[PDB]
Design a binder for this molecule. Sequence first.
Ligand SMILES: [Mg+2]
Ligand SMILES: [Mg+2]
Ligand SMILES: [Mg+2]
Ligand SMILES: [Mg+2]
Ligand SMILES: [Mg+2]
Ligand SMILES: [Mg+2]
Ligand SMILES: [Mg+2]
Ligand code: NA
Ligand code: NA
Lengths: 156, 343
Amino acid sequence: AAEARKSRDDRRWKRVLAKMDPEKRKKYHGVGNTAEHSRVRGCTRASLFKRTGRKPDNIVMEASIHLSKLLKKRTFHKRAPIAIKRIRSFVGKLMKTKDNRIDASLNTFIWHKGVKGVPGRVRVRVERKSETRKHFYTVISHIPVPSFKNLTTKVI
Amino acid sequence: HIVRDVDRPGSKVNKKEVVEPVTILEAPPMVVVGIVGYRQTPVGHKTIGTVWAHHTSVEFRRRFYKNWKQSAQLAFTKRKQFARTTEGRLAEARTLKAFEKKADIIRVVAHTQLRKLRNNRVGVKKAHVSEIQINGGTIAQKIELAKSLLEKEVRIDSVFQQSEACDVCAVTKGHGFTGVVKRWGVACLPRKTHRGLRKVACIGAWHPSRVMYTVARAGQHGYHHRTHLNKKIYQLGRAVSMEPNQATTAYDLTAKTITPMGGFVGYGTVRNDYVMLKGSVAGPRRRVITLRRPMAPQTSRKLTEKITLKFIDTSSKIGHGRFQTKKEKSQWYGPLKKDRIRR
RNA sequence: UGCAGAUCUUGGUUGGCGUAGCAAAGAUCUAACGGAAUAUUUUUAAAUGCAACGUUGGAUACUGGAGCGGGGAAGG
RNA sequence: CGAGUAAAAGAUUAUCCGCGCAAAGCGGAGGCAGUCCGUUUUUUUCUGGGUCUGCCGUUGGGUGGCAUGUGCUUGGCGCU
RNA sequence: UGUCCCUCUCCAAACGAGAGUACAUGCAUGGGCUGGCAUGAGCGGCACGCUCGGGGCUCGAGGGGCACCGUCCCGAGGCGCUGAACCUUGAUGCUUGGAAUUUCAUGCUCAGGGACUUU
Ligand SMILES: [Mg+2]
Ligand SMILES: [Mg+2]
Ligand SMILES: [Mg+2]
Ligand SMILES: [Mg+2]
Ligand SMILES: [Mg+2]
Ligand SMILES: [Mg+2]
Ligand SMILES: [Mg+2]
Ligand code: NA
Ligand code: NA
């Protein structure tokens, strides 16, 4: 009952706005859907998201976390323990899991500059596994990089 | 802030330049959807009825729901099925006849267009609704204007004029629970005071044996409704899509818009019509503010002065801005390292 | 040999009240193991089993030889 | 269950609307068949098609206005 | 049919309460913009480096030490690559809707879950 496929008003408006495109001088900068470096007018961006099935249980993801924006004006002797909790909640929300192992390589990197010197940015490798209802858990490890520029999230 | 020349005989700044801070407010056009009428009784004014427009937008109907995207969205559906029928037309004529016969005040229901104000930081999508009174003419003439305005846009340039004054109604910035020193301005106590010095020493006499309402106490400060008077209108600008040279005056031929370099902090870009008011207004950025026609008499030399702007500042409000335009900054610096990579 | 009070005696119960607080001596983190203390649902995974404990390895940090080092008297 | 409108104005508010002074007076209103109930004045309902306006949601089409991606005014199509 | 709780934002906020959003450029990451500081590490000395494939440029040091005159080394600082390098929204700056020999670009959502409403 809640199907409501519709998607017709987009069809009507796009054929209409094409109809009176003929003018002496068009102006109307973005009204025509033919434009560069612009969104698609008439529908939401989320309507263009490719919908597939549920992702498999075993996936690997590489992502960067901006830590300095999560630790601003925080009490000094709490920064390293707080950063561990923030990373756990960051990954857990994405993977929909409550069991997240931190692993020694990542724990050493967070603590390697003292309790008040947590690095601003970190790159992590996240792997989700299942074992036996089924139980899902995540292992988080460190990925050393020379520079963080031009790096975006990837799925293996 | 701006620069202008003042005309004030007998003053020390007569025919001289001054610098005046101003406030910029974005004003997308409003939409009129309803008509209401009032009658006078020995106990006050009473509403007679309401005439609604046949077609209303989604942003208006969003106001009557807490979760619009997960609801049935049935508001005004029954009235739409009935309003234009033969019985519906008769019912509307009956209400309009009542307005003509026995009404005293005529007002119109209007709402804002948040969709046209494409602001990234203003999160609300349901429109703001308010009532606007119609002044002037007889009751019949007031109703005629309201009917012609139904289901149409109203632009701010048709209500106000440049070099006019106006009144501002707004809610001030909040501060939460506050002590007496900041809330009321009382004096602090000497340094040797046991148990703290940011207090009132004596809060009453022995008799009457209670604390009175005139004594300063700690509590909520800020977030109050206020009405301020006599704010001059320095400019009524139009949308940047139509005319881009918003901040170009007859004495400064540089082509620029009203948005400063780097954008207004916490707000963004001004994309629609706007009004420039002299001085400050209550509330933080992104808040909705009502402007109304003046209440006090407008006959003083200050109130009737004609305003002619000479310079408008558009430097960055982050840091100490020293460039008026992007082109000016790229003329000071030559080609940088990144540009060298491109070429 | 008769109790309502003597800031009466001895027991018990009581509002205040889940309240006031449990704030000197800088500080803990992670994986594995142990444990009844879990990964506890019938009426996919998160939104329905939280929180906390010891040992070992690794990390971080403190005492800083007038020492939370190693030995004695008095006392126990 | 203990009933008071800073409301209307009539077969005791029932038994239609519009104009009009609680006037004078003057305008508009679809028809046919069953059923089911009924103490009369063209009795109440419920039912069925045939149908004609105003009007929905529509199939597309072209004219247009509004601040120009979102909805309207037109003008037809077949649909309640 | 609707309201609230969990999850998300901040014009609000001691806790309640509020403004909002309900697959949304919503969130995340990156790129540009606007700003802050003041020229990174490394390498080098008439060119085989730097600057305007070939042509024009331009290139320090108080001192000291080996090895029979130059050559090879130690040396704070200085010069070139270099208005470099780093930071820039987070209790919460801008940009995916004016134009522009450039300003935005990817990733994640996969029937949201629960309580009450006698309606
Ligand atoms: Mg004292
Ligand atoms: Mg500033
Ligand atoms: Mg007794
Ligand atoms: Mg307590
Ligand atoms: Mg204490
Ligand atoms: Mg110490
Ligand atoms: Mg020490
Ligand atoms: Na004292
Ligand atoms: Na000792």
